[PDB]
A paper describes a structure:
2′,3′-cyclic nucleotide 3′-phosphodiesterase ([name]), one of the proteins predominantly expressed in the myelin sheath, represents 4% of total protein in central nervous system myelin. [name] belongs to the 2H phosphoesterase superfamily, which is characterized by the presence of two conserved HxT/Sx motifs (x denoting a hydrophobic residue) in the active site. [name] contains an N-terminal domain very distantly related to P-loop containing nucleoside triphosphate hydrolases and a C-terminal phosphodiesterase domain. We solved the crystal structure of the C-terminal catalytic phosphodiesterase domain of mouse [name] in the presence of active-site ligands, including reaction products.
In [name] crystallized in concentrated ammonium sulphate, two sulphate molecules are located in the vicinity of the catalytic site. The active-site sulphate mimics the substrate phosphate group and interacts with all 4 conserved residues of the two HxTx motifs and the two central water molecules in the catalytic site through H-bonds, being also in contact with the backbone carbonyl of Pro320 and bulk solvent. The second sulphate stabilizes the long α6-β5 loop. Arg307, between the two sulphate binding sites, adopts a different conformation in the sulphate complex, turning away from the active site. The significance of the α6-β5 loop is not known, but the detection of a sulphate-binding site and the different conformations seen for the loop suggest it could be relevant in [name] function.
Numbering used by the authors: 164 to 378
The structure:
């Protein structure tokens, strides 16, 4: 019977490779004071001065090896769960390997992730009844696809996908900056309100298995 959720779980090698790249990006935001000051300000505003390690702040992360979620099923209880799981494409894809393209890394006051750009084949596994469709209104299907690398202590890692969409909505408008500058792996954008996106000069391909997770 049905899992807590379905998704693509990264292999040991790829999970550590993405983990490290996330870490380094947090350290770059934290090592340069233009960047840290602004993130620290939309995190804590005018709270008592306090030291902040971004890698520590984003220490919380959903259980299990790193993953890109498709459908939350809650063991059959969530809406659309049986209809998702009965699909031949899902049955067929279970236990099989995929490669996920990571196009960007992003951080907000609530979360740290990697944007996934799904192939057309992988989109056949993307559900069509996701919550808040207004949030991705006018964006291609599969826009919120992501791997959550960390989130702040009182944030549900589901927030990560909404944070990504919000960034993609702003960049569809053009309220993206010109890049604040270059980092080793690409152009860095300050979108405002403590939101940062690193657009990778070259996409990272990470290996993963499509399967189900139990709690």
């Amino acid at each position: 019977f049905l899992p807590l959720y379905f998704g693509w779980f990264l292999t040991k090698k790829s999970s550590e490779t993405l983990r490290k790249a996330g870490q380094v990006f947090l350290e770059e935001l934290g090592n340069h004071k233009a960047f840290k000051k602004e993130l620290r300000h939309f995190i804590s505003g005018d709270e008592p001065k306090e030291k902040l390690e971004l890698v520590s702040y984003f220490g919380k992360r959903p259980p299990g090896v790193l993953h890109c979620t498709t459908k939350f099923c809650d063991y059959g209880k969530a809406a659309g769960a049986e209809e998702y799981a009965q699909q031949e494409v899902v049955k067929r894809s279970y236990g099989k390997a995929f490669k996920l393209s990571i196009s960007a890394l992003f951080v907000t006051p609530k979360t740290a992730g990697a944007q996934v750009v799904l192939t057309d084949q992988e989109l056949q596994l993307w559900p069509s009844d996701l919550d808040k469709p207004s949030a991705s209104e006018g964006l291609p299907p599969g826009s919120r696809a992501h791997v959550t690398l960390g989130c702040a202590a009182d944030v549900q890692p589901v927030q990560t996908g909404l944070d990504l969409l919000d960034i993609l909505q702003q960049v569809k408008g053009g309220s993206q900056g010109e890049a604040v500058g270059e980092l080793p792996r690409g152009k860095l954008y300050s979108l405002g309100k403590g939101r940062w996106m690193l657009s990778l000069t070259k996409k990272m391909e990470v290996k993963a298995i499509f399967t189900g997770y139990y709690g």
